[PDB]
Each structure stands twice: as C-alpha cells, then as structure tokens.
Amino acid sequence: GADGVGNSSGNWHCDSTWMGDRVITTSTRTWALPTYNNHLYKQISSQSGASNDNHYFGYSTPWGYFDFNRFHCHFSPRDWQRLINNNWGFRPKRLNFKLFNIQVKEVTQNDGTTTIANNLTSTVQVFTDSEYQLPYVLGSAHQGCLPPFPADVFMVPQYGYLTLNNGSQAVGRSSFYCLEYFPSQMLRTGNNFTFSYTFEDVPFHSSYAHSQSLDRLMNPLIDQYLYYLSRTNTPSGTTTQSRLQFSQAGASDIRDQSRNWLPGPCYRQQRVSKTSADNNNSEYSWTGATKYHLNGRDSLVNPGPAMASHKDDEEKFFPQSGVLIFGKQGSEKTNVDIEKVMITDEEEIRTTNPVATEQYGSVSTNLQRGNRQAATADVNTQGVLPGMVWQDRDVYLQGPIWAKIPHTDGHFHPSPLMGGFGLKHPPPQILIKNTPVPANPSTTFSAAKFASFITQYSTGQVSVEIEWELQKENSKRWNPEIQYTSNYNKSVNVDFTVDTNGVYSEPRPIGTRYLTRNL
Amino acid sequence: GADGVGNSSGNWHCDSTWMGDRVITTSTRTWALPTYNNHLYKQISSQSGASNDNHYFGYSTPWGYFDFNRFHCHFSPRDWQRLINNNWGFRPKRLNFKLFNIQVKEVTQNDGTTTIANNLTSTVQVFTDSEYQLPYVLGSAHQGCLPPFPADVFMVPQYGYLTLNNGSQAVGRSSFYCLEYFPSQMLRTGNNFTFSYTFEDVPFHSSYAHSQSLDRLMNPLIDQYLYYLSRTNTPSGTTTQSRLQFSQAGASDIRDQSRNWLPGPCYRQQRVSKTSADNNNSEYSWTGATKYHLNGRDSLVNPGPAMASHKDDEEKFFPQSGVLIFGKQGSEKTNVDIEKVMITDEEEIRTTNPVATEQYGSVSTNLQRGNRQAATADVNTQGVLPGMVWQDRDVYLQGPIWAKIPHTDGHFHPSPLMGGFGLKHPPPQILIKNTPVPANPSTTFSAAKFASFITQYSTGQVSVEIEWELQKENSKRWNPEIQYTSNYNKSVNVDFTVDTNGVYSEPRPIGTRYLTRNL
Amino acid sequence: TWALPTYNNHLYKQISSQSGASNDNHYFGYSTPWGYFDFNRFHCHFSPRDWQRLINNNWGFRPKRLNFKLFNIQVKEVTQNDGTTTIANNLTSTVQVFTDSEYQLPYVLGSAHQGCLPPFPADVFMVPQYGYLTLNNGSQAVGRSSFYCLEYFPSQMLRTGNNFTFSYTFEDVPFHSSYAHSQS
Amino acid sequence: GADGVGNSSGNWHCDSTWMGDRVITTSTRTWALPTYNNHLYKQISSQSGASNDNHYFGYSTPWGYFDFNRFHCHFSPRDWQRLINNNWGFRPKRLNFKLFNIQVKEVTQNDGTTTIANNLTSTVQVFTDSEYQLPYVLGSAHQGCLPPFPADVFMVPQYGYLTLNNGSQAVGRSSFYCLEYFPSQMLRTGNNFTFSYTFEDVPFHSSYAHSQS
C-alpha cells in the first residue's frame, strides 16, 4: 500500500517487446467485483431427480477470482504472428501480477432510482494461496477470462468447488474449506497489491509440422537387405500347393518394408460430417459417444487423446467429440446451430498419430493349420507399446495455456489433453472479496447473526506480465514455407477488428503450427 | 566375535523412538535353526503326472535364511498409529541387523528318551551375498517372518530356488548354485555378527485418500467456453431430420464437460459376493479367472493392477483374485471357509482408478452413414495412454514391505503389485547353516563320503533396526478427519492382545490411508 | 468483524430487580454505555480440525501467551428522515478504547455469557454491553456498594486511521489433563 | 558384565554404619527364579459367579520382580534402636542396587528322579523401567520381600497387573503391556548388573510423641 485518496496507485505498463531470444508481454484491464451470496457460504448439490452421472456435491463461496489461462489475453493477433511464422517453439519462463487503483462504491435503492457514491473507508481483501491447499478450479476452461480486446471491462467470476458425493449426498471424506481462514491483505483506496511467480522447467511446445510421414523414412533408390514373406502358395498345377517364397522390399512395395517405429496410441471416436444430408437420422449423440466409466457413472471423453482428424482429402468429416470447438461472437448457450460454432481442424499430425475415426490396425485372431484358414480382427484401441512416437495437440489462440497435474502416485507423460503446459505447481489462484459492512444494529444486544449489510461493490485495474522463451528455426529447405496470411480481398469488415457497433470479434481459430520440420 | 562362554555377546535394545522427522524402530526375537536335508543338496521337480502349468525344476539347500519383509515385524499396533493418523507419507531410509548369543545343542536319541547337552566347540556360519548373485526368494510373500508379538519364538525357514524347466526336465541354461562356494563367517559360542544397509532413493508411499474425484475438478458456478455436440437431429415435422446442434456444458450436465485427464489403466476381474446365495452354482474358479499366458502355460494374476474394488454402496462384492486376503489366527492351509479369511477392502481409489469388475469405457466400432446406424463396444482392457493418472495399492500392516525389480532391459513404473517399495538393490539375503560334525569314522581308510553325523541344532537371538522418514501433512480442511479407532464397547477379549490361553492374534487388516488430501 | 451500537443513550443507569420477586432473585447494580470484547471460549481459537492435533496427539496443554489488536475502524452516522434511513461516513468521529489491566473493575468475564467471537470466521458479531452488580439488601443498596464510572480511566481515542494493540503474558498454571486413566 | 566362569562377579558388602548425621545400610540375600507361565502371557479375569465388587480383569506376565518395601529388610532389631530411641526423625536420602553371581541350572525329569546340571551358555535378562511406564505394583503390601534374617533364601515373585473392567469383561480403554518391548540387559554367567537412585525431597517421619494434648 501507499499514499492514497488523490494519488494513483499505479500506471499502465501494458506493452509487448521482443529481444530476439525471449518475449515479454504485458496487458491491463478494468474489472468490477460484485458481492456474491450475501456474504455467506452455501452448500450446493444437484437436483433431486437427475441421472446417476449428473450428481454433484459442493460449496459456493462469496469469494471471486482472477483467471488468465488463455493466450488471447496475452497476445494480440499481430504479436501472435512473430511467434507462429518465425519460431519452432515457445515456453512460459516467468510471470508478474498486480492490482492497483482500487475504489469502492456504495449504492442506495431509495425510491425508484438508485444513487451511487464513494465509500472511502471501505476495504477489499486479496490473497494468493501459493501452497496449493485449495481445490484448483483453473484449467477447467471456464468463462471469465480477461477480455481479448484491451478496451473492454469484465466481471470477476465467483469461486466454488466440489468434493466426494454419494448420489446427491455427501460422504464422510468430503472436505469443507473456509477461505476466511487464510491470511489475506486488506486493501483500502490508496493501497495496492503485487506478487511474482516462476515457472518450473517444461518442454517447448512444438509449432512445427513434419515434412515426412512415419510411413516413408527411407530412400526409394536402394533395396533393403531384409526379407519378408511375399507369396504363400505356388501354382504347381491346375491346383496350387503350399510353398513359401521370400522377397526383398524395394520402392515398388514400401508397404512391406521393415521399420523401427510405430504410430501413437488411439482410443477411437465416432465420425460425423459437416454436410447435414450425410449424417444418420437418430439420436446417437450420447449412445454413440466414446466414454470412460468411473465409479459406476459414465463421462464423455471430450478432447480425447491427440489424433489426426479428417484423414486425407476428406475435410467434410470430424470426430464426434474429438476436437475443440469455439463459438463465434454472441452465441447462445444451448442447442446452437452448425454455422455459429468454429470447429478446429487438426490435420498436421497425420504423419504420426492415427486418424481419430479409424482403427489402429489389424491383429491375428487364430492359429492357422491345414484345414483352418487364417483370420484377423481390427483393433480399435491401443495403449502404449515400446517404440511408438506421437505429437500433442495445438494450443491455438483462445484456448487454455496451462493445467495442473493431479497429485498422484503415478502419471504417464504429463502433457494435458486440451492443450498447453502441464505444471506440477502452476500459477497460484488469486482470490478477492468485498469486506462486509454492517448496517445500523439495534440498540439492545442480540447475539443473533447479522442479516443486514450495506450494499456495495468495488472496481479497479489489473495488470499481468509474462516472459516467454523462444526456440528459433534453422532449416535448409529450399522452397518457401506456408505462412499465416490475412486475405487481401475487400470486405465489409476487417478481420479481428471492431464492427460498426463497437463489438470486437475473432473470425476463425488460429493454430500454432505452420513452419515445417523433417521427421 | 569376542570373548565368550560366560560372557553375553549382546543386549536387547528393541525400542521405538520418534524424533519429529524420522522414525527409528528396533525389534528382537529368539530363533531355532534345524539341520535340513542331512547336510546335502537335492534337486527337486514336480510330480510325474501334473498339469502343464504346474511343472517346476529346482534345488533345495541345507541353508536357511532370515526374512523380515512384513511391517508387523517392525511396528506394534500402537506405533502404527502415529504413522497412519498423523502422516501423509513414509519411506525406509536405512536399516541395521545383527545376531548374538549363539548356542549350539547336541541331542542323543539313546533308548526311548532324548537328552540334550551343549556342544561348546561347534560352530555356525553366516553370510550375506549383497552382490545379488543368488536367486532372490524374498518378496514372494512366504511364511517364516519374525513373529508380530515379541515374546514368541520362531523357526528359521529352509532355502531353495527354481530355474528353467521343460516339462519336469531341466534345460541346458538352468543354473546350479552351491552356497558353500561363498565366503562366510564361522561363529562359535562367543562370536557375534553384524552388518548395515542403506536404501536407495524411493518415492514416498501415499497414505492420503483424495477428497475429489477425477470426475469433478471444477466449480459448478461457471459455464465452460468450449462446445460439445448436444443433439443429433431435430423434429422438423412429424418426421425428424438431421441437424447438428452444439451446447456449452454447465452444472446441469457435467458429464459432457471437457477434461485434461483420464482414469488409470485396467485389466478386468470377475466379480463375486460375500453372500453365499448370490453367487452362481458351478466351478468358475479356474475357468472364470483372469490369467496371463507365458510360454504355453497359464498363470493366474493374483493381485492384478491396482483398482478400486466394490464400487459404491455395494460392499457385498469383491473381485475374484483382485484383492489381498489374510487368514485369521490358526487357519488351515486348504479349502478354508469364508469367515476364517480376512478379505481386504480398497475403496479409497475410486476417485482415480476404475472399479475392478467393470469395463474401462466404450469405444466406437464403425463409421456411420445415412443408412448405417452407429455402434460401439465396451473395452475390457487398457494399456497406458498419455495423460492418465492412478494410485498404488495399500501396504497394510501384515503385508510385504518391499520387492526387488527384476534385472531387465526395460520396465514401466517399477512399483510392485502386492504393495510396498520396489528396489533395484533391496536388503540382501542373510543365510545361516549348522556346520557338519562327523561321527566316529572307521579305523581303515575309506574314501567314500560320510553318511553319519552328530545330530545337533542351534539357537540364539536376532535384532533388526530400521530408520524411516516421514512426510507431514499441512491442510486447511475445516472439518475433522476420519481416524483409526478401537471400539469402546465391552468385549470378552481386547483386540490385538493375547487370549486366555496365551495366543496373540490380529483381528482385522489395517490399511495405511485415512487422512485426506485434495486431488 | 464487529459492530458497536451506542447503548443507554450515552448515560449510566442503576438497575435493580423487580418489586415483587423471590428473596433470592434480588439484585442491585449499574449498566454502562460501554461495551466489551470477550473470547473466553476455545471454539474462537480452534477449528474442529486444529482441535484434533491437540486431543489425539497430546496429554496436556496450557495457555502461555496472547496478543490482541483492533484496526480498520470506521464510524457511520444514520439519518431517519422520512420513512427510510440513510447512512453515511463520519470521518471526524472517534472511538475510545482502554484495558484496565490493574483489575480495578468488577470482572464480568468467566460467567459464561453470550457474545463470543463467532466460531466460524465469516460471521459478523455484535459487541455486548457492560454492566455490574454490587451489595444489595432486598432491592435496595447498602452503604458499602460501589459505583464505578468508566469515564474516569485513561483511554485511547481512535479516529479512522488509528489502531490499537496490547499484549499479555499468562502466569504459570498446571497443564490440563487430556488423558483418561487405564486403571481404577 | 565382566570375565566369568571361574571368577566371581561380586563380593558381600552387607554392613551398617553410623556417621553421626546419616545412616548407611546394606544387606545381601540369595534368590531363586523359576520360569512362570511357560514363557507366555495370559489374560486373567475373576470367576464367572462372583460379587459385583469382586470382579477384575488383567494379565499375568512370565516376568518376575525384586521388591524391598519393608524396613526389616534394611534394619536388624538392634540397628532399629539407634534410630528409635536416639532420634526424632529420619528420611530416605539415597539408595543403590546390584545383582551378581548369576548361575543357571537345567533339570532333566528322566525316569523317576530328576538331575540338575549347569547350563553355562544360558542367559538372564533384567531391566528397570525408571520412566514409570508400567503399572506400579509396589506399595500394595504383597508378599515376597527379602527375608528379614540374612541367612534365608527367597523366591522371586511373579509380575501381573489389572486394568479397567466391566463385569468380568474388558472395556475399550484397557491397556496391554508387553514387557518384551522394553530394552533389557542380557546377563550370562560372568555378567553383573547395577543401578543407583536418588530420592526426591520428602518431609521427615515423626518418631516423637507429644507431651501435651
């Protein structure tokens, strides 16, 4: 804190710089914090009637929180292009955070019109847990981000959490956390708040696409010295007899060649098309879904393991849940049409990961003999076999930056499914509250709890700064790369700009992988 | 060794201390060592008639060995409760071992009654391999532990080993080890023996249970910004037509929400019930078992991969082999009833690992089209997919502490299946023998091998000390934890105490995980 | 977080029992405008979980030392004009606080009255009024009964930006016994 | 412990001296220790039929114990008379204790007559709790004192204890103590044992009678 009431508690830094190695990003927004719940905790549970897998049990706090998990908070559409086109990889070294210029208003509903006036003595209290002692809500891809466009004002979302349940009823192991029981900093008008954070080592995200499929690793000019079994039986006469022949695989085959590697694992998806006439007429939405079954209830697998989507020369098809889906500007919550959503497309992983809608391969069912013919079956699911390789999912732009690895005895390969950077100790949650002000107590002592409070809210500015590390590309490719370009044709509205009514919108999803590497 | 015959070679430390960080444990027992095999090695094989998977080939040595692999050796029932209730994790830093007060008796069977007298000149010889050159028998959960109750006397078990076989016949690669070909220390009455050992780094065992299921990671109060496909077709008229709608998943669904993680892998089990009337009438014991097939013979998977057992609000069911089973005091070897065994229950892993008796999930079989409806199948088995998490099995109390990782080119996540700590260099085996004494050779030279020896046995005391490291809990949970408590009601006998005949017994299994953490 | 009303309209009053009453129900005393803070109860200082390190893990405990303070004082004035009240800051108003520490007042604490700090940290509570009793005969005072004016102590007058602190040290006291005996 | 098997582990001090201020007393006895219970603990309870106030619940250990709680152990009838006639008060400042010359015999019941022979390799194990962690049996005025007359030989009594009961049945708070779970010193033939102790301040006992009512 500092001097106040007529002295600002901070300026607007809010700029982006590029040092040739690392990137430094800063952004600033204006927020408004209501009082939630009327200053009291409440338990919340699902409805009486409900599906067995829709039940939940939890609590809802008066507190509220700041979240920037999304890139578009930290990157303009132009700054995003110093990154994509020019770089193979990037990772989040370090960040910095602060709040300033806090001011608290009180409102009076007298008569039919409200009035709003400053309360200079009121306070706001803020803390960051940083010991990871609370349930961690971030990384679930909720709403309430800092707006992508710097001039908008946003509303701070409410905080809540869930724990173990049986039906709609709690179990004995379920925990209840009172946020009032942490140390926090009470901020009056002239006071300000700061903290800084340091990311743990994490591998770079890969913004390259491969220039070679795992099918073809070799030169066609030279034959292998290994043999495979080419032909099972021979035409000895008008009737064939069994004779085993062997061959060496050259450029005329290439399906029969020996290899050191296999594609990544798969957990299979249903296929649907964007053309409405192609798809079947029924509800398969839930029945045809791919699911995992945990403790007697089923849960859809929305992102799934990373897989190529539409195969080759079919754009029309995408896996049912297998992809991320973003909404356009101003889309309603429920039952919205096809042209309102923006469906992501991942074709860049064809070279390693298998297509989401097709089988991994085929495997031999039985042992052949003289009188019993061979047989085989398609394998729809694979775990990880020694000697396989894969890629991860794009981070895109408006998608999530990081997620927290659960605390467990084992985990295989931490990278999270939606995208981005798995962290064992991610950026800590920041929680904020309006301190309650009692209103006009009775003259005689009571001992009952106060039901009456002054109605008030607060507002101010918030600033975030992150340092990013870059991985440059060095490549001998002769011919030019594919780049991200805005169309040069004329239009009614420019892309990624405000319209005539002052509404900022994002036309399309933008993925991170354009530049090409060889496998 | 030291001065002897009238001077003791050691005292009894045998105590437990708690330093606030690490635990130090000591225990002392009295043992008796017979001579086995009549001082000679023998090969042993399975019976002539036998199942193809019951064959074995091996050897049986005169030597015998000390094993403490079990916690109840090192922990009383009370000492076990500063650990469980007060701590999140513990691991075995260091240990210490010694033998002392050796005395050797010789017995004469003359007439119809034996007499037993000291032999002061006889010796006992002891060694520890420590280079891991012998077959390692420990970790197979055999009998012969130090007794749990300090006042009992125990018998030292015989040592043997198995190697490659074909049928009941040996192969050419099978190895034969003569324990006489190691250096050993010959201990006479006044002599004593010691060595110490240091555990390699191993991750803490997790004595917490999770307060959140992997289903629910998020706050119900806020909607996601991601979309899923809610409804496949639309009622355009008395007949429906295909139209794709999308939706955002809030608290009213939660089965459709996007997630960054998946449950652990599964290899499925058959389900049985404790109520006798429920189960089917037949022998499915072997036929309905889950098995793995190695070199043309089948082997039951007794512990299996770690899984939750009875699901939710069904206690009555447990997986067929999927759990550990302990016997009560004085239970016979074969065909014992249901109320004699103590069946362990693992419900604490529901939040991550899937139930042992149910499928992992469902996967799409085929590609839909206009005229072909969607279809899907249940997946009964999963390997490890990137981005899954799981937990390990409880160590309990009377179960095994550690096991030795096999020496191999690769192994995934070493932790062993029964429970406890996988070690690449575990505590070395200690082997002990009675030195043979010839009896009255003939007056004329023979050159035949001696068939006649003095009949004798030895006894003494043994002491073990282990240092344990503790991991304290720091938690903001408001409401109280579940703890382990002995019932306060009156009873004929107290639990974990001797009866009226002086027989110590353990009433129930005690697992290590009570205190709760958030996922 | 607390809220302090003005009691009695800024004046002392003597109080006595009712005219008709049982001989053992009579009392004589005074009621002050002042009000007081009391935490005499454990649930103020211990959550239900923190209470379980103590019980399960320990034979005895005693209160070595304590520390106390008040901060973020703000004073509101209310206007009853018409049918609806309005409430606004008075920035120049003060609040005055003292601790006797010489044990010169009647000591009300330890009688297990209401008005503790709430057990749950998010609640707001109301500061209770202070009063005391002295010798009586029937409903009438005796000559030895004493009258204490709290205005006659030194106190600290706290305006909006001011704060208050003091600390205290317990005298030696034997541990409380949280064991039960295993032998009769 | 020390050298043994042909070397004594201690002498007989066993004397009384008077310094004009403080008294120093010493006494020595010979003991015999049987094995009790056949090397195992047993719970013990009262009989089925019994009065409500005669019920008890407890355990009986294989262990046995030394007790001198009685003056006649430490005072002859003559030494008792400097004290009484010549003094107003006395209190127990300090004590010292030891065991020595341990020898272990083994017995064979063969035929109709027993034989008894030395076992030189056998041991005896002794400890003192000193942290007061066991039930304290002493001070209940049981039998088994060191004899008053120095030439007698005595038998070491068995140890046992009681805890909470309801009827003849145990309650949940009742405790079970295994004496094997203490550190102890294992004494072979040539070994010996010692410890010393210091009394806390206690007021003198009053050996005067009043000359005024």
| CA A420 centroid distance within chain | 7
Token pair recorded at residue B435: 């030195």
D148-183 as b/e: b if 16+ CB within 10 A: eeeeeeeebbebbbbbbbeebbbbeebbbbbbbbbe
Strands B421-423 and B402-404, by their bridges, are parallel
| Minimum Cα–Cα distance from C90: chain A residue | A121
Identify any residues that bridge with A33 across adjacent strands, giving them in sequence order. Answer: A458
Q: Residue B480 and residue C57: Cβ atoms within 8 Å?
A: no
Task: Using alpha carbons, select from C95, A257, A292 the residue that is nearest to residue B361.
Answer: A292
Token pair recorded at residue C104: 């010169």
How far apart CA B54 and CA B245 sit, in angstroms, is 60
User: Residue B466 is part of a domain; what is its CATH number?
Assistant: 2.170.30.10
Residues of C with CB under 8 A from a CB of B: 47-49, 51-52, 56-57
Token pair recorded at residue B347: 């419900």
Q: Are B320 and B309 in contact (CB under 8 A)?
A: no
Beta-carbon contacts of D149 under 8 Å, excluding residues fewer than 6 positions away, are none
Token pair recorded at residue C94: 């003060």
Cα-based angle C91, C97, C100 (whole degrees, multiple of 5): 170
Task: Give the resolution in Å.
Answer: 2.9
- Which residues of chain C does A125 touch, with a Cβ-Cβ cutoff of 8 Å? none
Q: Is A347 exposed, middle or buried (0-12, 13-18, 19+ CB in 10 A)?
A: middle
Mutate to test the interface with B, among C43, C46, C49, C182 (most CBs of B within 10 A): C49
- Torsion over CA: B421, B424, B426, B430 (sign): positive
Beta-carbon contacts of A102 under 8 Å, excluding residues fewer than 6 positions away, are A9, A124, A187, A188, A189, A191, A192, A458, A459, A460
Beta-carbon contacts of C122 under 8 Å, excluding residues fewer than 6 positions away, are A39, A40, A41, A62, A178, A180
Q: Residue A265 and residue B385: Cβ atoms within 8 Å?
A: yes
Task: Using alpha carbons, select from D52, D37, D213, D62 the residue that is nearest to residue D124.
Answer: D62
Strands A209-210 and A516-517, by their bridges, are parallel
| Minimum Cα–Cα distance from B152: chain D residue | D40
Token pair recorded at residue B258: 């996007």
Q: Are A40 and A450 in contact (CB under 8 A)?
A: no
Element (H, E) at A128: strand A124-128
Task: Using alpha carbons, select from B219, B193, B176, B24 the residue that is nearest to residue B125.
Answer: B193
Q: What is the DSSP string of A16-55?
A: EEE-SSEEEEEEEEEEEE---TTS--EEEE--SS--TTS-
Question: What's the number of domains chain B is made of?
Answer: 1
- Which residues of chain B does C57 touch, with a Cβ-Cβ cutoff of 8 Å? 86
Q: Residue B222 and residue A383: Cβ atoms within 8 Å?
A: no
Q: Are B345 and B318 in contact (CB under 8 A)?
A: yes
Q: Is C137 exposed, middle or buried (0-12, 13-18, 19+ CB in 10 A)?
A: exposed
Quote the minimal CA–CA distance from D119 to chain B in Å: 8
How far apart CA A72 and CA D39 sit, in angstroms, is 78
Q: Residue B85 and residue C48: Cβ atoms within 8 Å?
A: no
The Cβ of residue B183 has, within 10 Å, a number of other Cβ atoms equal to 6
Beta-carbon contacts of B430 under 8 Å, excluding residues fewer than 6 positions away, are B65, B66, B97, B126, B127, B128
Q: Of the candidates D135, D162, D173, which has its C-beta nearest C180's C-beta? A: D173
Q: Are A62 and A175 in contact (CB under 8 A)?
A: no
Q: Where are the beta strands (DSSP E) in B365-482?
A: 376-379, 389-390, 402-404, 421-423, 430-434, 456-472
Element (H, E) at A291: strand A291-294
CA distances from B463 to B12, B28, B155, B400 (A): 8, 4, 15, 19
Task: Tell me which method was used to determine the 3D structure.
Answer: cryo-EM
Q: Are A396 and A373 in contact (CB under 8 A)?
A: no
How far apart CA A393 and CA A412 sit, in angstroms, is 16
Token pair recorded at residue B108: 């004469």
Helix (H), strand (E), coil (C) string for A170-225 = ECCCCCCCCHHHCCCEEECCCCCEEEEEECCCCCCEECCEECCCCCCCCCCCCCCC
How far apart CA A135 and CA A144 sit, in angstroms, is 18
Beta-carbon contacts of A390 under 8 Å, excluding residues fewer than 6 positions away, are A263, A264, A265, A306, A349, A352, A353, B386
Cα Dmax for chain D? 73
Token pair recorded at residue A412: 């295989």
What are residue A302's phi and psi, to 5 degrees? -75, -60
How far apart CA C152 and CA B152 sit, in angstroms, is 78
Q: Where are the beta strands (DSSP E) in A320-452?
A: 325-327, 341-343, 361-364, 376-379, 402-404, 410-411, 421-423, 430-434
Q: DSSP code of D63?
A: E
| CA A445 centroid distance within chain | 53
Residue type, B459: T
Q: DSSP code of A279?
A: S
Beta-carbon contacts of A326 under 8 Å, excluding residues fewer than 6 positions away, are A341, A342, A344, A398, A509, B225, B226, B227
Q: Which domain holds residue B230?
A: 3-519
What are residue A179's phi and psi, to 5 degrees? -70, -20
Residues of A with CB under 8 A from a CB of C: 39-41, 62, 108, 110, 119-123, 178, 180-181, 186, 188, 435-443, 445-447, 449-450, 454
Cα-based angle C84, C89, C94 (whole degrees, multiple of 5): 125
Identify any residues that bridge with C3 across adjacent strands, giving them in sequence order. Answer: C126
Question: Given the structure tokens 């008395």, which residue do they identify?
Answer: B238
Element (H, E) at B80: helix B80-84
How far apart CA A213 and CA A207 sit, in angstroms, is 17
How far apart CA A516 and CA B18 sit, in angstroms, is 60
Integer Rg of chain B from CA: 29
Quote the minimal CA–CA distance from B481 to chain C in Å: 7
How far apart CA B475 and CA A181 sit, in angstroms, is 11
At C152 the three-state DSSP class reads helix
Name all chains with 3 or more CB-CB pairs below 8 Å to chain A. Answer: B, C
Token pair recorded at residue A498: 């405000």
Task: Using alpha carbons, select from A318, A308, A306, A370 the residue that is nearest to residue A342.
Answer: A318
